[PDB]
Symmetry: C5
Subunit: 311 residues, 5 copies
């Protein structure tokens, strides 16, 4: 089999559609997600045309091997789609209607800047390369683009599944490539992060501040160093669920800034003790009394600055 | 091969049955489980009918390629099933009796709200797409739906394996589809969670309460802080075995509430010390004496409420 | 090809044998193990019979596609067996000698009750479904059941590889199934657990008992709490290497009981301090002196009782 | 099919090109990376020559099985590449233009000496083995070597993708082999390591140096030991993300040297206390006062040297 | 196709050779490694013989299906090797020269006794089963056994790749099997273990010994207990990367013995405090002064002894 010939000099229009059946395994570190969907292809092949009245059969059904099917591939897939051909239907006029069910691991980058209050646009790029005979061009049949209502992605809210109707036509290795952009819009469910990471992390920090109502250097050293230790664990815990980035993330900024607070609390605790030993507890008392106010405030303002910069 | 033609205008009824041989790998974080089962299909194809007299055979065996087999797929599978054909038998009226052995990774959501005292309903959805020639409809042959007695799922009690007899017929990509719902009912074996997570977590909390029978600020700070850090370990330990949810979980609620108790115990420990230093240990003594009773009581009440809200 | 016809009304006897070449990957959590073995099949097909005198060839060699081979499957395999056929030999009387080399992931439950002093019986179930023409029955050719001397399973002692000679014949989906039980007997190599888990865990416990020869509450508090946290690590470390069970394990019981000892030691440490503060160190001295004997004695007695219950 | 015949005694030139579509999964520990690219191949087979007048078509399209294709393999791949032929075009003279889309896990060693400020040269080696009939030689068509603009590798900056135009021709197992070297130049994005590992590690170190402004042995022991323990945590965390090397890495050197600082701080803390107990706090005061300066200075000097040695 | 017939009653000699292209993934816990190599096979098949004069070619090239190829398998592989036939060449005297490129996961046990100063001999066992027609025997063509210079195994030094020239012939299920032993000799790169595990572990131990120059029970308790806690981490960290063995390893012995040192240091610290409280610090002073010497000496001696027992 060879491609259908052009009536006039026109490129072949392959109408495409992706219908999500299942979406799963959004790996933040790998910046990948798995998808299970229907891929629909429609093009016209005059060689396959027939008479409806004469033939009696409204539609003719073919096996993939029997007819010419355009070679459609995904740009951003990790491991090549396992495809199932569901049906091939030919109209009297020669309009072919192809439908396959596929599953693929899609590689699509993520913006972690606003984590865990981030939204993402996942991309699925369809591509076709032109043949020497004729040029192939992709189009979106919006009637055949969608998703099942039950499509869920653990820890995410699925906003929309749409296609950018206009293909990106470009030359690559001296042949035309027609690229289509399917978009899955999702927003992270930040709920869990509040009682699991955010609040426990604030409690340990407030506990460190009780050292501002104590004169016991030994108790203070324990309060500040221990609580400090809990933070490293939280800091570490998160890095593990995140890939290295060239920029700072929201949670990353909060976590880093909290380190400075522990460092300064240690300084205060050290200063207060030093003065007490130098028999000047009135200076020490002033610093401790100030810190009670300054820490919470500065900390408070700084977060406002951070949230402002990040959102 | 093409579908069997309708005698009158009727849709083709494909009788289905799933018999579980094995169930394994229930991944809580992935919300998936693996299954190994028999899939039985039965439909009438008059074209294959024969007379037992002239043939001398009560049944006829065919190779899959030789005859028309309805394209049955699973909706909620991750990695498309690997199938083995066990046997294809044709009765004299042309009644086909198909049997395959398959294995598949099924994606079915889980409700973690009552963890680890939760029960789940796992779903296996069978589907068939109608062809242009005729409509294909699924039915359940309850005689061919079951499970082996030895079917086990590690850390779970297998309640039942049943099918919702009435299919969900609907349109998708301008063709009708007949969807069937097979249900595997399971309940979590919470036993382990008691000596592994629950009890150790209560012991560490109760240990923090000995600070209510001590005047030593340094010992108390050590008592609370140390006990506190262990809570974090458990809190983390659990969450790593569980996915992010938009709602609170029973264990999650208990764990979060326990953080508040440590926070308040730190406050009491701080308050008691402050008063002792301000040369007013009679006030301090009252608060500490109240704490010995209030903490346990409030804890008992709050837990009651939580269990009430969750069950 | 169709099954060999019965001379009289007899079922077809397929003689089976499994010869282990390799055993590996015993996953405790998954309750699975991987196996690489020879599968031998032997049955009589009279249609294949010949003359040795005139043919000049004692044995005739066939390709799988050329002859009828019984469909033998494994009941308990996690995933698809790679199968490669080494040889098919036909004796003059028509006795077929099939030999394949396979590899499979077998799912077989484990009893963790006596961990790490447990022994297990791994099962490999062979099965054959009877055809409409004739009934197929499995048999064990003990001559062709064995294992290579070099077969090893990391962290386990391989006791025996035997077959239960009598098949389990039963009806399933209105046809006879013939099931065979191959058994791999193994016992865990508990050596490592002594210097890695058991002894370190006892040392930390004994270190907490030094608090019985100290009057320093702050010191005692530190001893007991610090030692305590290490136990959680061991407790935690261990449980991660295990699946959740509906029962208590030996190690699990020891670990849980040790928590009670820390809890009571904290109580004693608290009591001793309280009395010392209430200016009654003679009562405190009696309790501490009793504790020095009592803890070890009880601990020892408790351990004996448990061992008794578990073995 | 056999190789095309020489027209003089010349070896067959297979022109090659690799165009990266996707690069992902750079595993530092495994020293591997996954790639998804186009493999272009061009050779001349005069046996495929045709007159466009007779055939109708200016360019002929063949299926891989139909014609002779040079056996091109990758030297440094983990499992055999996943390949799909995009197109096979033949021009009238018999010039074949082969295009396949492949994905492979490439094993290429990494130099960790400058981690996390290291750059790497990833290699992809193409190879062809000569036949007894004629010798096959590889060449680079620079017009068909490149990468998509959107090619990204998480945590890395992609510098260049080039080919060493001159093949490495050599004898192996009494036949000629033509090897080509494709190079992917990348440099690590060290940003994250600063707020995640480097800075937290320095803060904890400086927290320990506050022991130089304290006379409390008990507080100092807590400061130095506690802070010390966190270092082990960071030290360990880092090791996990790196493989064993026969050399010392930049981060590894910093981490190791920091251990010495804790060891010496413990000595100072011990010395200071010993003198204080021996009723000679004036000597102790001198050492502590020196330490306040020497530690930071020495540390600083040492880092410059190492920084210097490594770069 | 059938095997080449014997001229006299001789067994068929299949000359073998393995040439390593790549070595990777040495999994210590799994006791496996992955290999990518050339497998060369050579045997005489007289039926394939020809005259160079008549034929006009001095070599004949066949496709695998066309001729009889001996069924060579690997004994110790996890899954059946991924093989691609590179070439099949026939000399005029019926000498067949087969070449395939394969990749396989080899299961070969490791001796951890001297870890991390251990050397290993990895085995690759080639095997052939004799047919009813004739007996097959393996031989090593040393000219075709080798490895690429660039072959590396992360964290290991590759010593040699050789073959035991004499096969192990034996009966298995009443057929002769010819087994060959290919050996890959490797020695572990212990470098990393010194600054990563060994030295940090000695530093924490030495820090615990500073308790011998302190009278502060509370300070001492903190020193020993804290440091002890670091030891568990190292002990735990190590055991995670190593399988359970029925014998002690070198590192395992050092780690275990160090536990005894902490246990005895706790006893000394307890004893010293007890005497101090009983108003007898002169006895306490003697024990502490002895400990300063006895601990280091004993420790030193014990390792010498151990080093001796292990090497
Ligand atoms: C620890 C320090 C406190 C951290 C709090 C961060 C929350 C935040 O400030 O994040 C803000 C986000 C919502 O942002 P958005 O909908 O993406 O807006 C994008 C649109 N623009 C472009 C107009 C900005 O969170 C929430 O809706 C609820 C916050 C609950 C967290 C309670 C604690
Ligand atoms: C920490 C504080 C204590 C936590 C204990 C929570 C147990 C619970 O409250 O859970 C209750 C569950 C059973 O619930 P169900 O079978 O789903 O009932 C659903 C039907 N309704 C809606 C009518 C209620 O557990 C048990 O039978 C035994 C658990 C014993 C735990 C001992 C400690
Ligand atoms: C910490 C608390 C101490 C734990 C020690 C319990 C080990 C045990 O007592 O276990 C006993 C087992 C043997 O059991 P079996 O071979 O299955 O006997 C089954 C047959 N019966 C029913 C007739 C008995 O271990 C051993 O051979 C030696 C263990 C050395 C432990 C050293 C520490
Ligand atoms: C703990 C002590 C501090 C450790 C900091 C080491 C960083 C360094 O000194 O490394 C320097 C490297 C650059 O090296 P290069 O580009 O490979 O040089 C190759 C060319 N030559 C051979 C001519 C030199 O990083 C950077 O561009 C910025 C590092 C900012 C880090 C701030 C903290
Ligand atoms: C903690 C206590 C210190 C641990 C040191 C153990 C190292 C060892 O003693 O082992 C020695 C091994 C080499 O042994 P081999 O090559 O197997 O000799 C086999 C031949 N025979 C049979 C004659 C013995 O390491 C080394 O080359 C250098 C190790 C330096 C480590 C410095 C720290
Ligand atoms: Cl694709
Ligand atoms: Cl499916
Ligand atoms: Cl099977
Ligand atoms: Cl390859
Ligand atoms: Cl093999
Ligand atoms: Na302390």
């Amino acid at each position: 089999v060879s491609p259908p010939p052009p009536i006039a000099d026109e490129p072949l229009t392959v109408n495409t559609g992706i219908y999500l059946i299942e979406s799963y395994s959004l790996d933040d570190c790998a910046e990948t997600f798995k998808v299970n969907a229907f891929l629909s292809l429609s093009w016209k092949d005059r060689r396959l045309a027939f008479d409806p009245v004469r033939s009696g059969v409204r539609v003719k059904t073919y096996e993939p091997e029997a007819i010419w099917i355009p070679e459609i591939r995904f740009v951003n897939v990790e491991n090549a789609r396992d495809a199932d051909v569901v049906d091939i239907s030919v109209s009297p006029d020669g309009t072919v209607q192809y439908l396959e069910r596929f599953s693929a691991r899609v590689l699509s980058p993520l913006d972690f800047r606003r984590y865990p209050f981030d939204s993402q646009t996942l991309h699925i790029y369809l591509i076709v390369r032109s043949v020497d005979t004729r040029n192939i061009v992709l189009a979106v049949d919006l009637e055949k683009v969608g998703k099942n209502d039950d499509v869920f992605l653990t820890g995410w809210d699925i906003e929309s599944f749409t296609a950018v109707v206009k293909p990106a036509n470009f030359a690559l290795e001296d042949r035309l490539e027609s690229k289509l952009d399917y978009q899955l819009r999702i927003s992270r469910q930040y709920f869990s992060y509040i009682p699991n990471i955010i609040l426990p992390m604030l409690f340990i920090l407030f506990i460190s501040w009780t050292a501002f109502w104590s004169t016991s250097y030994e108790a203070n050293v324990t309060l500040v160093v221990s609580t400090l230790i809990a933070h490293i664990a939280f800091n570490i815990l998160v890095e593990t669920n995140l890939p290295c980035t060239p920029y700072m993330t929201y949670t990353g900024a909060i976590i880093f800034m909290i380190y400075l607070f522990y460092f300064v609390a240690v300084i205060e605790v050290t200063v207060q003790h030093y003065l007490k030993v130098e028999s000047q507890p009135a200076r020490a008392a002033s610093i401790t009394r100030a810190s009670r106010i300054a820490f919470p405030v500065v900390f408070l303002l700084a977060n406002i600055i951070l949230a402002f910069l990040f959102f």
